[PDB]
Amino acid sequence: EIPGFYNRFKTQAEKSTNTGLKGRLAMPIRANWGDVGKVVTIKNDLRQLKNLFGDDMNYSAFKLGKL
Amino acid sequence: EIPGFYNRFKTQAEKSTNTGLKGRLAMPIRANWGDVGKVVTIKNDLRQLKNLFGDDMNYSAFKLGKLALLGNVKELLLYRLVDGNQKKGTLTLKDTTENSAKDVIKLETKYPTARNFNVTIKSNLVDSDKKDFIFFENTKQLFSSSIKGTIDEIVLEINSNLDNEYVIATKVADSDTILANVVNQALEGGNDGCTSITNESYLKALEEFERYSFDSFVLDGVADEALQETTKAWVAKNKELGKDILLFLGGKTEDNIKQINDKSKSFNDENIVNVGSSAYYENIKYTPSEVAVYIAALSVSKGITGSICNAKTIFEEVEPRLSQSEVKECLKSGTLVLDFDDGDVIIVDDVNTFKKYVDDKNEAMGYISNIMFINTINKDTSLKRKEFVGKIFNDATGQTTVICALKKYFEELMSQGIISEFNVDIDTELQATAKADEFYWKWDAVKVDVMKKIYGTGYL
Amino acid sequence: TGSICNAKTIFEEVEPRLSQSEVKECLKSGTLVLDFDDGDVIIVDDVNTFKKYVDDKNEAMGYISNIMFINTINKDTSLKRKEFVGKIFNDATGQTTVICALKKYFEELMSQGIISEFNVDIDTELQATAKADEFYWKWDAVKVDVMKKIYGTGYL
């Protein structure tokens, strides 16, 4: 680069981390909503499940995902 | 010098000083009066603003300047916006000795304008050849003078006294003849400054503003959308170029709180602050951008060692007015909105438009004070560039000197209490990969917080 | 013991004025152009016209300070010519004396910190092929660099 003193700040995840989670699980699911024909990874926030596959407890998807 | 005991007294500013001001602000302005095409710095005395840009509240210049000055900015930097047709007022004078009268003096306003600056010339009652030159604005007299009937001395006197600073006199011909009498003749031919002002004028003003350094920008108290995206891109460019400029914005008065929140969602760069609430100060309303001028001014005046989350405002009323649900909606949207928590108008919080997002750019980045802190650190560091770049040899000694200087700076910050904890060290991870002509370094810190929320529990 | 890549200039204005793209274009072209990085006029970099080419004449040769260093070494060495040429017998003693003098000079340079590492020795490859009335010698060095670029990363 050109000479100079160019800062690039990286307070991304300074101390916003916790180690209370582990493992990964497979899930065939019936769902009223969400993507079809693909294996999608869901982070442990249930909001992600609610967004990507709906919030209907009548279906295996949301109920088993919450469990 | 020659031998002797020569005193030179320096009771200039012995104890005539106070420390109640800080910060600097940028201002594109429309004005009826004042300099054009230059970025002029204004000290916080409003008399300076009144002198250099007039006292007309119909124009963005004086009104937004007064708001910024009440924001307690140390130095307010202005720029007069105009269309190319914008022009100075002018008047011409003629002799009377000759039957074929010839123009001999022309009067032109010192600054471009369209106001009714008027002039009167009459026969002097004491001396025969003298003419009494008097100047007005809508018959409100500015200055009076009397000079004999020679054109050179007349124009020299008219240009000499700064009481006649509103107008410049120039000689049209080298006559020694008696001038013609005029009575309250306006300096016509001028054009105002609100004439056909468009986005291109603001773009040119911003390009002029690229020269300087600022703590904040507010964009003339105008909420035009295309100007807002243009200024957003401009500030992003300035940030990438190492100029850390903060931007405040205010939505249109017609926008509902939902629309304001949508706009505050659209903006997500940390250097963008969207203002929703309108207000009254002297029983006169202010659009969200006009009060965005004031909130930016107050923020920069606060500087470090402060915030705005409950700073009292000068405004006597605020609207639209929000329940706690609406306030929470606006804060979640990143909108900043004033509030009437008490009999005065009070700023609700320190939020910016970015606050809609959370984790990578941390939640403190959602607050304006943290951004001001980071910009200040970047600015002081980019001041250190010239001290250290190209002047020390990259050896262990040079690296140690740089680290020691940065440590001294951060310890100065610690002494002020702004930082609760810090460490600064060489970035040995990147220093291993660093080329021989460069240096990498790392630092952690913990800015000292402020009470926004407080809770009490009682036992009896 | 210095450079020009950010030396402040006496000039109150500079033109034509360049964005980072234009600056990078000029540096890649080997052009040297002043800049207005702050309220003063500042020299952008240490580049020379050669810098367009890269590897054989190394990238440091693209910088003027390295050329000044090399010219200074050549000048001091060509000053030593008159001390050593035609005045010492090419035996092991004369070669050792020449090498010791050059080592003393380079150690003086090391004391100033200009060089981070060096070695100077007889060029035994060419000395084997050398005619009896001549001498060959070799030296490696590492000039001490200067910060042109600096990068910082922050944690809060």
Numbering used by the authors:
A (entry chain L): 13 to 79
B (entry chain S): 13 to 472
C (entry chain M): 317 to 472
Copy text from the publication.
The virion can be divided into five distinct regions: the head, neck, tail, baseplate, and needle. Structures of purified φCD508 virions in both extended and contracted conformations were determined by single-particle EM of frozen-hydrated samples; the resolution ranged from 2.6 to 4.0 Å for the extended phage, and 2.9 to 4.2 Å for the contracted form.
Contraction of φCD508 in urea reduces the tail length by just 20%, whereas most CIS tails that have been described contract to ∼50% of their extended length; the outer diameter of the sheath increases from 230 to 250 Å, and the inner diameter from 78 to 94 Å, sufficient to break contacts between gp55 sheath domain I helices and the tail tube gp56. The contracted sheath retains the arrangement of gp55 subunits in a six-stranded helix, but with a decrease in helical rise from 39 Å to 32 Å, and a concomitant increase in twist from 19 to 34°. The measured 20% reduction (48 nm) in tail length is consistent with a decrease in helical rise from 39 Å to 32 Å for 57 rings of sheath protein. The contraction-induced movement of the gp55 sheath proteins can be modeled as a rigid body pivoting motion about domain I. The overall RMSD between sheath protein monomers in the extended and contracted form is 0.63 Å, confirming a rigid body movement of these proteins. In both the extended and the contracted form, the sheath ring retains integrity through its mesh network, similar to the sheath of other CISs. In helical reconstructions of the contracted tail, the tail tube cannot be resolved because of a mismatch between the helical parameters of the sheath and the tail tube. As the tail tube does not contract, the resulting mismatch in length drives the tail tube through the bottom of the baseplate. Furthermore, the X-loop blocks complete contraction of the tail for φCD508; we modeled the φCD508 sheath proteins into a more contracted conformation, based on pyocin trunk structures, but increased contraction of φCD508 sheath proteins led to steric clashes between the X-loop and the neighboring N-terminal linker, as well as domain II of a neighboring sheath. In the contracted phage tail, which lacks the packing interactions between the tail tube and the sheath, the bending stiffness (persistence length) is also significantly reduced.
